[PDB]
């Protein structure tokens, strides 16, 4: 397979070539070591056993070479496994930061996790365990066919022609067995879909006093469908039985032809016995490959995963308040246009808001100016410099974000906030601390900023984690600052910290906000109301609110909802 070659490091080409050469040499010092049985057993069973010693001598003198070249192939295989594991792991870990975020559909993320995590021992033992036995057992039948075609030409031609028959039987057996497994999985999953339908809808049924009728209905359905599980045995019947029967049929056919030639006088009895022995040896590698199938299947799966992650799309590449521009930018994810007709030119150093229904494509805007995803259409620029054409290391110091999910890398509060600018002095850290208001949690936290605030370290609530994110984003010297919306009403101090971020920011830098609740829609300069990725409104805060537009209705609904108390109107 091409990908298994492409995974090779470029430095070990003189190692792969040596591996291939010594593998063919190993094949041709046991294939000849097998055909050399014929002079050996043609003397062993004959009237002159003493002739066996010479051919035994030149059998051991090739088995020793087989040992030496096998050792030199296997040590080289260990080296190549280690240096393909390291090479592909580093290539993946370099690729993934540059992978566009549109790739992380969560089956893709699951496969990437599997490739990164589960492939350690396997790749170290790829050539040693899978490929070397595969090649050494695949070439051996053809090698014996050629070596028994040069010697005793009427029979080697039959052996080489029957290699096709036996490999066809093996391939058909494997194909039918794989299809049988697929069919069994399909039928089993189809029968029990009703049980999952029950389990998901268990609460709504049980509270409705309908659990027993639904249980009876599902039981009746299962009983009705049960009887139709037998008719599709036509493909498991020729499973491993097909390969075993084909192998033994070929065995008996060759043995019968040998006995027929013996009776017809074209061969001697010892020659006809040694031919049978070699024609048994000619079959053994096929059984070895058939035994080796599941390892090949699992390695094909893992190589498919590594190929999929390796070929994932990757972004191209190459201190005042910048100007941010969208030149009629559009973007699509899945099977929908997550961004439709998006264009603007932000005046530098301003505060801007974004609002709309959740799932409408609001955070994807921040992903676009953040450089997380290249634009499908249009241009995204910073002071006219297209982000795709921006230099790689320079792009990472151009923008800052406060995400809807306040990700924390399992450090302390100081350690988490220090992400973005580790070189900042302690007074700057204290100033950002005061601005983000996380110091209020230090009055609650046991060990102050040194407390670990990972997922297992502290059960930090979403507003508080977002506040830590505001601190982190405020610290760094990004020319552009961005904020998202996950401000639950449980923490009003989080809203106060957001307000201070809009208003009390010391540094000069363009500010953009994405907002749902009142505190985050108040002090901006303009709003880009998003709906299904389409910017349906574009205007000032007062302009849109006083005009009675969609933003006005949204603000009215949010304010009315926030004012409610339970127990009366």
């Amino acid at each position: 397979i091409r990908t298994l070659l492409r995974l090779v490091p470029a430095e070990k080409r003189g190692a792969v070539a040596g591996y291939a050469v010594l593998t063919l040499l190993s094949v041709l010092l046991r294939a000849v070591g097998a055909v050399l049985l014929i002079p050996l057993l043609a003397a062993l069973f004959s009237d002159t056993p003493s002739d066996a010693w010479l051919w035994l001598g030149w059998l051991t003198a090739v088995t020793l070479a087989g040992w030496v070249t096998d050792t030199n192939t296997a040590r080289l295989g260990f080296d190549l496994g280690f240096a393909v594991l390291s090479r592909t792991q580093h290539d993946m870990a370099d690729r993934l930061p540059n992978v566009a975020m549109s790739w992380f559909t969560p089956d893709n993320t699951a496969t990437a996790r599997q490739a990164i995590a589960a492939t350690g021992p396997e790749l170290a033992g790829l050539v040693v365990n899978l490929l070397t036995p595969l090649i050494g057992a695949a070439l051996l039948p053809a090698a014996i066919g050629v070596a028994l075609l040069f010697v005793s030409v009427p029979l080697g031609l039959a052996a080489l022609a029957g290699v096709a028959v036996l490999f066809g039987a093996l391939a058909l057996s494997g194909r039918l067995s794989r299809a049988a497994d697929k069919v069994a999985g399909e039928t089993n999953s189809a029968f029990t879909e009703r049980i999952i339908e029950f389990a998901r809808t268990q609460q709504a049924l049980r509270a409705a006093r309908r659990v027993e009728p639904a249980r009876s209905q599902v039981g009746s359905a299962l009983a009705a469908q049960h009887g139709a599980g037998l008719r599709l045995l036509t493909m498991q019947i020729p499973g491993q039985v097909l390969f075993s029967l084909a192998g033994q049929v070929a065995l008996i056919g060759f043995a019968g032809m040998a006995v027929w030639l013996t009776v017809r006088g074209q061969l001697g009895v010892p020659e006809a016995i040694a031919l049978i022995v070699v024609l048994v040896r000619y079959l053994e590698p096929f059984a070895a490959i058939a035994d080796l199938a599941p390892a090949l299947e699992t390695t094909r799966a893992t190589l498919n995963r590594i190929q999929a992650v390796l070929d994932a799309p990757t972004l191209p590449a190459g201190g005042a308040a910048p100007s941010i521009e969208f030149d009629d930018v559009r973007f699509s994810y899945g099977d929908e246009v997550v961004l439709d007709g998006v264009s603007f030119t932000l005046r530098p150093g301003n505060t801007t808001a974004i609002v709309g229904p959740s799932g409408s494509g609001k955070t994807t805007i921040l992903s676009l100016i953040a450089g997380l995803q290249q634009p499908a259409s249009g241009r995204v620029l910073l002071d006219g410099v297209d982000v795709t054409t921006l230099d790689p290391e320079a792009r990472r110091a151009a923008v800052s974000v406060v995400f809807q999910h306040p990700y924390l890398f399992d450090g302390t509060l100081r350690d988490n906030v220090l992400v973005g600018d580790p070189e900042a002095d302690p007074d700057d850290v204290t100033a950002a601390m005061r601005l983000a208001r996380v110091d209020e949690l230090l009055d609650r936290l046991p060990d102050g900023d040194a407390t670990v605030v990972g997922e297992g370290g502290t059960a930090l609530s979403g507003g508080e984690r977002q506040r830590v994110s505001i601190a982190r984003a405020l610290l760094k010297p990004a020319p552009v600052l961005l904020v998202d919306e996950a401000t639950s009403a449980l923490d009003n101090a989080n809203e106060a910290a957001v307000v201070d971020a809009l208003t009390a920011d010391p540094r000069p830098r363009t500010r953009v906000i994405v907002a749902h609740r009142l505190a985050s829609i108040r002090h901006a300069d303009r709003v880009l109301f998003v709906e299904a990725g389409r910017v349906v409104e574009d205007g000032a805060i007062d302009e849109l609110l006083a005009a009675g537009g969609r933003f006005a209705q949204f603000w009215a609904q949010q304010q009315a909802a926030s004012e409610w108390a339970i127990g009366s109107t």
Partner: protein, 557 residues
């Protein structure tokens, strides 16, 4: 194991018969390697053509018999598997309708999807694939070894030399790296978690980088260095193990052991033919036992996983809207209280809220009203009757709860409101919908009240929650249980959800999980839980005047 044995009770006999038949088939497929030996014997003896015809027809009869049985047994085993898996699926169906409701609420354990769908299929491969393949892989090499020993024990005993070397080297390797093998799966899980954090925390690494970007690379390099330091010092061991198993080394050893014997006249030469036929692959067959036993073990894992589900306790039943709670204490697992010795009482038509940021079993306390689990101590009574003694026909028409993550049944939306009362008329369903403020979206949906719904549907979370509120309205349950998280679950639908909740709560007794402190001012009795127990109780105004924990929390907000 006890769980796996208990689950596979009725299949004790069919599995034994399948094992016997697989042993028979495997012995049949190693028969022609005996008939070729007899063919060589006849050729050396110069037998007439008819005897060789007899042998060559026997070797076709046997390979026809061993291909007819191996499709006329694994055709019987398939329908036996069907007849058992049906009685297991139809048993898990009955067990789903008797487990406690909170078991379905995920405790972080295996999902409802995997725990049946994957495990029934793995049990299928245990019955029809793993056990037959395993008995075949266990009976083939032992039959081969017995045949080679009875043929010529002196040459067969020499075959232990590669086996002894392989086992000795494996024992030397495993002991020499005990710490590494102990560490290996834990390192695998640790780097799996690290990859999960790296992938899930991708945008921070992409936009900030610094420590976050380099942490993954450093940990990955540590893992790769661990693997390299573990495997690289054993190349000379492992390659030497690989050599001694190969067919070529067995062939050379057999020939060097037999040719001196044959030439010296110490054994009849045709006794060496079975070893050349079979013994040359003796090494590569013992290496296949582990795969079959691994398949059996993987199947038994799923067997145990299904068995544990069938062994969990059932929701037992014993024996004006008032609710009474007395000294209740609940623990999810023993030794870990989450509610302890709390006490409460609710008048008919009243409202009660549970507040606190620490949790303190607030959601657990609310769920225990509808007996998602049984209280380890204390009791809960509705209208004077202990909740333990109310079957589902009465309990959940007395107590109609709506918590977070409402689950929608498949069918018409008109039906989907009327699970609690399928006899409800169209006008009744419409009035319930307009009470829940869900009539608008249903009218917007293309087929109106005829429209179907289910797992695949366009309705959002808030719309589905309002649908469930309409269902609860049609249920007409005097006592209720509620979670305030459904209020701010969807800010866009928060107005309509608020109106629906207010309509539902107005005429009916309600107990609420409260998170936002500003949303409870008129509730007749506010409650606060901390340290998994009651600390203060009182109304909003009285608690504010008291200056207790509620006042501090509200001042914080």
């Amino acid at each position: 194991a006890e769980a796996g044995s208990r689950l596979l009770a009725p299949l004790k006999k069919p599995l034994i018969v399948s094992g016997v038949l697989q042993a028979l088939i495997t012995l049949i497929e190693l028969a022609p390697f005996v008939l070729l030996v007899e063919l060589a014997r006849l050729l050396l003896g110069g037998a007439e053509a008819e005897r060789l015809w007899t042998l060559g027809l026997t070797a076709v009869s046997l390979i026809g018999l061993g291909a007819v049985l191996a499709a006329a047994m694994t055709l019987w085993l398939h329908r036996v598997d069907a007849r058992f898996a049906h009685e297991l699926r139809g048993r898990l169906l009955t067990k789903l309708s008797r487990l406690p409701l909170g078991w379905f609420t995920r405790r972080g354990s295996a999902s409802t999807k995997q725990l049946v769908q994957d495990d029934t299929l793995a049990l299928h491969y245990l019955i029809t694939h793993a056990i037959p393949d395993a008995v075949a892989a266990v009976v083939a090499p032992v039959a081969v070894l017995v045949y080679l020993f009875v043929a010529d024990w002196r040459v067969a005993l020499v075959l232990f030399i590669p086996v002894l070397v392989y086992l000795v080297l494996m024992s030397v390797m495993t002991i020499q790296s005990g710490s590494k093998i102990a560490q290996a799966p834990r390192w695998a899980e640790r780097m799996g978690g690290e990859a999960g954090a790296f992938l899930e925390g991708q945008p921070v690494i992409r936009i900030f980088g610094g420590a976050a970007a380099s942490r993954f690379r450093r940990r990955l390099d540590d893992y790769i260095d661990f693997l390299v330091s573990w495997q690289r010092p054993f190349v000379g061991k492992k390659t030497l193990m690989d050599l001694v198993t190969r067919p070529a080394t067995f062939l050379w050893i057999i020939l060097v052991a037999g040719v001196p014997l044959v030439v010296t006249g110490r054994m009849d030469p045709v006794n060496l033919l079975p070893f050349l036929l079979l013994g040359t692959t003796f090494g590569a067959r013992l290496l296949g036992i582990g795969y079959g036993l691994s398949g059996i073990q993987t199947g038994m894992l799923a067997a145990r996983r299904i068995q544990t589900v069938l062994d969990e306790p059932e929701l037992v039943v014993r024996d004006p809207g008032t609710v009474e709670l007395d000294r209740v204490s609940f623990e999810y697992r023993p030794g870990v209280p989450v509610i302890r010795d709390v006490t409460l009482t609710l008048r008919p038509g009243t409202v009660t809220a549970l507040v606190g940021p620490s949790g303190s079993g607030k959601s657990t306390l609310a769920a225990l009203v509808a007996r998602f689990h049984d209280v380890t101590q204390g009791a809960i009574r509705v209208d004077g009757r202990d909740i333990r003694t109310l079957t589902a026909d009465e309990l959940y028409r007395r107590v109609g709860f709506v918590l977070q993550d409402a689950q929608l049944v498949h069918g018409s939306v008109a039906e989907n409101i009327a699970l609690a009362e399928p006899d409800a008329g169209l006008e009744r369903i419409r009035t319930a919908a307009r009470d829940a403020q869900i009539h608008d979206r249903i009218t917007r949906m293309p087929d109106g009240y005829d429209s179907v719904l289910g797992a695949g549907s366009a309705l959002s979370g808030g719309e589905r929650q309002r649908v469930t509120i309409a269902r609860a309205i049609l249920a007409d349950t005097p006592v209720l249980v509620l979670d305030e998280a459904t209020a701010f679950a969807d800010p866009e639908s928060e107005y309509l959800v608020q109106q629906a909740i207010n309509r539902l709560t107005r005429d009916r007794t309600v107990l609420v999980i409260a998170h936002r402190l500003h949303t409870i001012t008129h509730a007749d009795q506010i409650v606060v839980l901390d340290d998994g127990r009651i600390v203060e109780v009182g109304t909003h105004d009285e608690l504010l005047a008291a200056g207790g924990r509620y006042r501090g929390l509200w001042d914080s907000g």
